[PDB]
Design an enzyme around this catalytic site. Sequence first.
Site, PDB file in Angstrom:
ATOM      1  N   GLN A  20      25.268  63.702  28.786  1.00  0.00           N
ATOM      2  CA  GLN A  20      24.970  63.469  30.207  1.00  0.00           C
ATOM      3  C   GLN A  20      26.223  63.039  30.992  1.00  0.00           C
ATOM      4  O   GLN A  20      26.213  63.055  32.227  1.00  0.00           O
ATOM      5  CB  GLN A  20      23.865  62.420  30.375  1.00  0.00           C
ATOM      6  CG  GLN A  20      24.359  61.029  30.051  1.00  0.00           C
ATOM      7  CD  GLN A  20      23.268  60.012  30.003  1.00  0.00           C
ATOM      8  OE1 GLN A  20      22.855  59.478  31.034  1.00  0.00           O
ATOM      9  NE2 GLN A  20      22.774  59.753  28.813  1.00  0.00           N
ATOM     10  N   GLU A  23      32.319  65.746  29.044  1.00  0.00           N
ATOM     11  CA  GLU A  23      33.200  65.734  27.890  1.00  0.00           C
ATOM     12  C   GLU A  23      33.705  64.376  27.585  1.00  0.00           C
ATOM     13  O   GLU A  23      34.910  64.146  27.648  1.00  0.00           O
ATOM     14  CB  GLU A  23      34.420  66.602  28.155  1.00  0.00           C
ATOM     15  CG  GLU A  23      34.061  68.038  28.288  1.00  0.00           C
ATOM     16  CD  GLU A  23      33.533  68.652  27.006  1.00  0.00           C
ATOM     17  OE1 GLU A  23      34.145  68.438  25.933  1.00  0.00           O
ATOM     18  OE2 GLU A  23      32.528  69.401  27.074  1.00  0.00           O
ATOM     19  N   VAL A  24      32.779  63.463  27.324  1.00  0.00           N
ATOM     20  CA  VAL A  24      33.080  62.185  26.801  1.00  0.00           C
ATOM     21  C   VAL A  24      32.407  62.096  25.429  1.00  0.00           C
ATOM     22  O   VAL A  24      31.213  62.427  25.292  1.00  0.00           O
ATOM     23  CB  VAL A  24      32.572  61.050  27.719  1.00  0.00           C
ATOM     24  CG1 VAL A  24      33.003  59.591  27.224  1.00  0.00           C
ATOM     25  CG2 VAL A  24      33.011  61.301  29.199  1.00  0.00           C
ATOM     26  N   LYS A  39      37.146  60.173  26.697  1.00  0.00           N
ATOM     27  CA  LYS A  39      37.018  61.236  27.689  1.00  0.00           C
ATOM     28  C   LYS A  39      38.134  62.217  27.452  1.00  0.00           C
ATOM     29  O   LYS A  39      39.302  61.840  27.287  1.00  0.00           O
ATOM     30  CB  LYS A  39      37.082  60.686  29.122  1.00  0.00           C
ATOM     31  CG  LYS A  39      36.961  61.768  30.168  1.00  0.00           C
ATOM     32  CD  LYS A  39      36.709  61.206  31.569  1.00  0.00           C
ATOM     33  CE  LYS A  39      36.551  62.404  32.526  1.00  0.00           C
ATOM     34  NZ  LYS A  39      36.385  62.050  33.942  1.00  0.00           N
ATOM     35  N   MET A  86      30.189  50.723  24.685  1.00  0.00           N
ATOM     36  CA  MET A  86      29.151  49.739  24.967  1.00  0.00           C
ATOM     37  C   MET A  86      27.936  50.125  24.107  1.00  0.00           C
ATOM     38  O   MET A  86      27.317  51.178  24.286  1.00  0.00           O
ATOM     39  CB  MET A  86      28.878  49.681  26.473  1.00  0.00           C
ATOM     40  CG  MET A  86      30.104  49.245  27.315  1.00  0.00           C
ATOM     41  SD  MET A  86      30.627  47.532  27.066  1.00  0.00           S
ATOM     42  CE  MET A  86      29.154  46.716  27.751  1.00  0.00           C
ATOM     43  N   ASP A 131      30.154  57.145  42.325  1.00  0.00           N
ATOM     44  CA  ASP A 131      28.958  57.452  41.551  1.00  0.00           C
ATOM     45  C   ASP A 131      28.283  56.196  40.978  1.00  0.00           C
ATOM     46  O   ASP A 131      28.011  56.109  39.774  1.00  0.00           O
ATOM     47  CB  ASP A 131      29.315  58.476  40.465  1.00  0.00           C
ATOM     48  CG  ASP A 131      28.111  59.241  39.961  1.00  0.00           C
ATOM     49  OD1 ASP A 131      26.993  59.004  40.460  1.00  0.00           O
ATOM     50  OD2 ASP A 131      28.288  60.064  39.034  1.00  0.00           O
ATOM     51  N   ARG A 135      22.521  54.676  35.804  1.00  0.00           N
ATOM     52  CA  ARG A 135      22.961  55.514  34.714  1.00  0.00           C
ATOM     53  C   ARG A 135      24.439  55.353  34.382  1.00  0.00           C
ATOM     54  O   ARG A 135      24.867  55.713  33.278  1.00  0.00           O
ATOM     55  CB  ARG A 135      22.660  56.973  35.031  1.00  0.00           C
ATOM     56  CG  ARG A 135      23.316  57.495  36.296  1.00  0.00           C
ATOM     57  CD  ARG A 135      23.079  59.006  36.562  1.00  0.00           C
ATOM     58  NE  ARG A 135      23.762  59.269  37.814  1.00  0.00           N
ATOM     59  CZ  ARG A 135      23.246  59.049  39.022  1.00  0.00           C
ATOM     60  NH1 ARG A 135      21.968  58.665  39.180  1.00  0.00           N
ATOM     61  NH2 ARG A 135      24.000  59.220  40.089  1.00  0.00           N
ATOM     62  N   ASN A 136      25.210  54.800  35.319  1.00  0.00           N
ATOM     63  CA  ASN A 136      26.656  54.666  35.189  1.00  0.00           C
ATOM     64  C   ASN A 136      27.054  53.216  35.038  1.00  0.00           C
ATOM     65  O   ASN A 136      28.239  52.849  35.188  1.00  0.00           O
ATOM     66  CB  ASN A 136      27.336  55.362  36.382  1.00  0.00           C
ATOM     67  CG  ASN A 136      27.109  56.830  36.373  1.00  0.00           C
ATOM     68  OD1 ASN A 136      26.969  57.453  35.299  1.00  0.00           O
ATOM     69  ND2 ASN A 136      27.058  57.438  37.574  1.00  0.00           N
ATOM     70  N   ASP A 149      34.137  53.308  34.768  1.00  0.00           N
ATOM     71  CA  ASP A 149      35.312  53.384  35.655  1.00  0.00           C
ATOM     72  C   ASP A 149      36.198  54.584  35.352  1.00  0.00           C
ATOM     73  O   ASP A 149      37.391  54.612  35.695  1.00  0.00           O
ATOM     74  CB  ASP A 149      36.085  52.044  35.674  1.00  0.00           C
ATOM     75  CG  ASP A 149      36.406  51.526  34.284  1.00  0.00           C
ATOM     76  OD1 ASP A 149      36.452  52.297  33.293  1.00  0.00           O
ATOM     77  OD2 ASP A 149      36.584  50.301  34.094  1.00  0.00           O
TER      78      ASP A 149
HETATM   79  N1  DKI Z   1      32.049  52.841  27.699  1.00  0.00           N
HETATM   80  C1  DKI Z   1      30.814  53.367  27.474  1.00  0.00           C
HETATM   81  N2  DKI Z   1      30.048  53.059  26.437  1.00  0.00           N
HETATM   82  C2  DKI Z   1      28.914  53.764  26.578  1.00  0.00           C
HETATM   83  N3  DKI Z   1      27.897  53.688  25.704  1.00  0.00           N
HETATM   84  C3  DKI Z   1      26.743  54.449  25.686  1.00  0.00           C
HETATM   85  C4  DKI Z   1      26.212  55.215  26.715  1.00  0.00           C
HETATM   86  C5  DKI Z   1      25.011  55.938  26.539  1.00  0.00           C
HETATM   87  C6  DKI Z   1      24.340  55.856  25.321  1.00  0.00           C
HETATM   88  S1  DKI Z   1      22.858  56.726  24.997  1.00  0.00           S
HETATM   89  N4  DKI Z   1      21.571  55.737  24.672  1.00  0.00           N
HETATM   90  O1  DKI Z   1      23.146  57.523  23.768  1.00  0.00           O
HETATM   91  O2  DKI Z   1      22.561  57.565  26.156  1.00  0.00           O
HETATM   92  C7  DKI Z   1      24.840  55.099  24.315  1.00  0.00           C
HETATM   93  C8  DKI Z   1      26.013  54.390  24.498  1.00  0.00           C
HETATM   94  N5  DKI Z   1      28.978  54.514  27.681  1.00  0.00           N
HETATM   95  N6  DKI Z   1      30.136  54.304  28.159  1.00  0.00           N
HETATM   96  C9  DKI Z   1      30.403  54.796  29.482  1.00  0.00           C
HETATM   97  S2  DKI Z   1      32.078  54.558  30.141  1.00  0.00           S
HETATM   98  N7  DKI Z   1      29.767  56.045  29.807  1.00  0.00           N
HETATM   99  C10 DKI Z   1      29.973  56.641  30.996  1.00  0.00           C
HETATM  100  C11 DKI Z   1      29.304  56.347  32.180  1.00  0.00           C
HETATM  101  F1  DKI Z   1      28.372  55.400  32.202  1.00  0.00           F
HETATM  102  C12 DKI Z   1      29.598  57.050  33.358  1.00  0.00           C
HETATM  103  C13 DKI Z   1      30.556  58.064  33.357  1.00  0.00           C
HETATM  104  C14 DKI Z   1      31.222  58.366  32.163  1.00  0.00           C
HETATM  105  C15 DKI Z   1      30.895  57.669  30.994  1.00  0.00           C
HETATM  106  F2  DKI Z   1      31.496  57.937  29.816  1.00  0.00           F
END
Ligand code: DKI
Length: 268
Positions: A20, A23-24, A39, A86, A131, A135-136, A149
Amino acid sequence: DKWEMERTDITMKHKLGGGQYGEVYVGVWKKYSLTVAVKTLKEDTMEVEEFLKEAAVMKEIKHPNLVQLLGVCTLEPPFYIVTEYMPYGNLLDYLRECNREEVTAVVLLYMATQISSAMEYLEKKNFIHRDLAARNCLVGENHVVKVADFGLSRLMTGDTYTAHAGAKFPIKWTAPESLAYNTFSIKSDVWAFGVLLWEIATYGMSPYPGIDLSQVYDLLEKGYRMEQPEGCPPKVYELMRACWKWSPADRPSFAETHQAFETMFHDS
Ligand SMILES: Nc1nc(Nc2ccc(S(N)(=O)=O)cc2)nn1C(=S)Nc1c(F)cccc1F
């Protein structure tokens, strides 16, 4: 610079959050037994300078409620940006799944306060997010919340960022002037913040339910706004409404929003 790290130090695993976020990826910095987010620059971007600008901003951010940059790989392709991971996922899912006897109205206020502290810091640094949404935002231990960020931009206060023609936005979080003219600012982030605050107040319901995306501008232009959610304190709704003022200049600053939340804790 000091941020450059060895790409072969990283074991790359699956796409983060089921794809979602584009490409992260989830990775492990093997040496340190540490899960990280990575990323990458893939087919999506013929825009290498843009990716480098994104990384540049991240190197200047340090705040307890913004995701921590750990390193980059930009000495050869493909370019990477590496942040902390996270483990508890995003705030939207967290609110939807949580036990509401644990995530009480007190905890919701803490969540909102931490997010407004992050945005106060970005405001002060003349950075725009573009954004802001549940969700972010990401959740940690003990209800710590951090705002993502990646994708930030430089923009001095009193200036406006114009997105390219045909740029696609998350409509229901987007200020009317951004909808109408592709014009973004710290005050369009403030608008998005009010929507996020409504997501928090409702434990992650979808905004403007039943309203088609084609109708959202016209709804807002005619002065309609999302109603006060059941049990949302009047003071929190007033703040929401301040964020959704028609003129960007009439919207509060994030300095003001953060203050409002601090005061709410003492008033409680
Ligand atoms: N630093 C970080 N850790 C995580 N952890 C995460 C996010 C979603 C899920 S899930 N339950 O698999 O969708 C699990 C762990 N997300 N994450 C962030 S920076 N995600 C993120 C975001 F929230 C917005 C834009 C780009 C992104 F990569």
